[PDB]
Amino acid sequence: MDLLAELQWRGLVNQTTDEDGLRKLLNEERVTLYCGFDPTADSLHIGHLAPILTMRRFQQAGHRPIALVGGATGLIGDPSGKKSERTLNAKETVEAWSARIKEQLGRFLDFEADGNPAKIKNNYDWIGPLDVITFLRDVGKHFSVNYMMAKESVQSRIETGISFTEFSYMMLQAYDFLRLYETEGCRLQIGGSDQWGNITAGLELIRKTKGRAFGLTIPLVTKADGTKFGKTESGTIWLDKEKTSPYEFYQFWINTDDRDVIRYLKYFTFLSKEEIEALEQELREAPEKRAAQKTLAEEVTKLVHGEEALRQAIRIS
Template identity: 55%
Template sequence: MKLFDELKWRGLVDNVTSPDVEDAINNEQLTFYIGTDPTADSLHIGHYSSLLMAKRLQMHGHHPIMLVGGATGFIGDPKATGERNMLTPEVLQKNYDALHAQISKLWGFDMVNNLDWTKDITIIDFLRDYGKLFNVNYMINKETVKKRLDSGISYTEFSYMILQSLDFYTLYKTRNCTMQIGGQDQWGNITSGLELIRKKCGADVKCYGLTMPLITKADGTKFGKSESGTVWLDPKKTSPYELYQFLFNTEDTKVIEYLKKLTFLTKEEIDALEVSLNEEPHKREAQKALASQVVKDLHGEEGLDSALKITNALFRGSFAELNDAQKLEAVAQMDQIECPCGLMLEDVLIQTHIASSKREAREWIKGNSISINGNKVNDPQMLIAQGNCCVQDYMILRRGKKNYYCVKMKEQEN
């Protein structure tokens, strides 16, 4: 399978600006770029497919450039929902430094900052040298801008397209960068960049654009910073265990798509996992493979080992084998119920709504269905206090094999 065919099989090609893109990807060694703005101090899972796309191309002889938009971050790419909040220079610099360190550590890509070639352009030069080449009618017909016309869009965000076009033009002139890759929502910015290059350098210039489908959840919403429950690539913001659990809980309808887009597993390996998913979905082999591959690629064998250790400890109820940091990672992923200290176990079950009555609570306790921090308990009148916590103020109750409850103990008020 040729590289472009593999990219299509993986679902990584949404649109291309020329039929020549396929031949260029298969047979040339292109310099291309992917960009992101420093609007947060970490990349998230929504960026991951694009970064792997760059790595896939690099492995076949192409040269990736990662652009972190120190300039465009001041402006903000227009959203369909409304104006972005302006970030201060201090926050943008902090975010830029964090992204630079993260990308360098994980992928080692060649990196550039568009503030370097934008900061010294005067407003007069900007309008004469670049603004004059953009037709307003052309700009307002771009999909993202068009969606904002009724609600309104500031000139600041409207001009974002020109700034990003300037990036492509500058990288073409200075680095012989002939292709830009972005999400499907970047089509308008990419084609505008190509137009600027042709107007500045001639219509016969061979430059290309490729867009990728956005990674979405089963409900159709995309992964991103503006969505709830952001999954970060920084292990301090989303631990390896949290990432593992997030991916392990992928719906059956999405897991094969994610395996294609977020891992380097071969077609044969993914096809075998798809057979397992269809014939024995309860084993969740596809989800295990997805979670293991992504966590290992991002956080190494050590991160994967820790994630699996916490997962297995929760499954078996063997909390004693975890250190305090791992216990806190597990606790962070559980719904927490507050309960005062000094109650009998049967009353704790009622107070936390685990049991609906004392009779039910006693039956469960005496029937060896209740565990505290992995240890079976069978005394309904056992007093529960801070000493029963497994880490900090948290106690893990389990009913049966699958029902876990994280109880946060608090001192009784006088």
């Protein structure tokens, strides 16, 4: 209702399986929602911040968030939003990376709240021990090849090529939704823009096994210049302060172009509408001051690295 209307105002809603049904439920109950993150490196990066902070926004509105670490799926790899087939990482690598990722995820969520404390989960726990036969029959019988080929992630790649490995990924994410729906009462899954297919797949699996749940995706973060958000000359802006120092993290945000600053304040910060609007007017009247840019920089660096870290960044600058 108002949480959903607020996300809408911010521009954090790309798509939704059924807006009125979801608004209704959000308004009448504490909703268990989840978001999955696959270890594809030893650190999350700014590409993960929207979904993460969006979880947080759901938690502040009184809902319970589940952060899912892709221990199993990080061993398969999602073709979604990838133009090319990826190389398989080793179990040891993935296993090591999941541990770190778990740690950065935990920073953004509340574990102390009673009623809606978060959970951090690892899909290795239920996918790890699943036998192929069980998988093919219990999950696979539910999907026609025709349904799966039509998926943006696959359609996007058949000429380019895609192994059966990545083609099947969707079944696994599908399965995660079902298991979370069953063991945790999870009724909503959220993700970036590219996850629509995988989410709806989870919904198809639930529908076909139970005969209730929703999906919501966040839009790709845009730049007015038409370049790739987070694509720096420096390379990725990581959330690990040992990969990207708080100083560099801070600078990155301080250099937001006047054209993007207001969209990023809405996306990445907890400033109200009235605070954000006021900054918009300050951006119009005094754009050499860079008030929108410092506010973003401070807000986001505090979120991710904390105040002390922010303090240093500021004094280093």
